[PDB]
């Protein structure tokens, strides 16, 4: 315990920042899908944003959250100030890779080490 605060004194204040970033991404998804001529649906993309913002829903510690948005903000900057081209963005969608089943029987049938 006894940790020093990075930018947010408590999960509460930190959550404020997450809200802002969500908004940012939400407002940006449409633009990217147009400035990058990505073949995705704005709605679809906006769900992806939600996915990511929740993939890390479990974090309880304020410090971890604060870094997470710093990093998140940095990603947005790379996508609104466009330095990240389609190949970079579409990677988020994991479009080419073949999905792996998580069913035990499925894995048994395919991989030595699951």
């Amino acid at each position: 315990t006894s940790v020093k605060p990075i930018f947010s004194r408590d999960l509460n204040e930190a959550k404020r920042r997450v809200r802002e970033l969500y908004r940012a991404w939400y407002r940006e998804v449409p633009n990217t899908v147009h400035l990058m001529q990505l073949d995705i649906t704005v709605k679809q993309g906006r769900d992806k944003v939600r996915e990511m913002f929740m993939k890390n829903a479990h974090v309880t510690d304020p410090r971890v959250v604060d870094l997470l948005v710093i990093k998140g903000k940095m990603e947005l900057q790379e996508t609104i100030k466009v330095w990240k081209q389609r190949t970079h963005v579409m990677r988020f969608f994991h479009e080419t890779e073949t999905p792996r089943p998580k069913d035990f029987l499925s894995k048994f049938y395919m991989g030595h080490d699951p």
Partner: protein, 118 residues
């Protein structure tokens, strides 16, 4: 002023590891033994934690070994058992520590070999 958190530093969310290799990878914290070939003990000093071994299929074109597991060759070295356990907890990898086993003291004396009755 400092803030209070009872949450075990877990930073699995910042490390940047693919989900599959954080929830399916068991690492073992062990002090390396000595290949019996040599009698030196300088490689049995520091604790090491090593990730579980994974597929090593033969390559069809040249017959070279091929591996799909990124964390295979990685063995991190930690000076003390407590510190290594900490690394597993904050990185979220499962751990199964093995106690160091050091040679027990053995009593030796050249005189014995010339014992009246051994």
């Amino acid at each position: 002023q400092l803030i209070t958190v009872d949450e075990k530093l877990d930073i699995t969310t910042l490390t940047g590891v693919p989900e599959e290799h954080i929830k399916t990878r068991k690492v073992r914290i062990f002090v390396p033994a000595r290949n019996n070939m040599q009698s030196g003990v300088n490689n049995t000093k520091k604790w090491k934690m090593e990730f579980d071994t994974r597929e090593r299929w033969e390559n069809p074109l040249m017959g070279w070994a091929s591996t799909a597991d990124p964390l295979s060759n990685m063995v991190l070295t930690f000076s003390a058992k407590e510190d290594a356990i900490a690394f597993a907890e904050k990185n979220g990898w499962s751990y199964d520590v093995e106690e160091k086993k050091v040679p027990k003291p053995k009593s030796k004396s050249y005189g014995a070999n010339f014992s009246w009755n051994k």
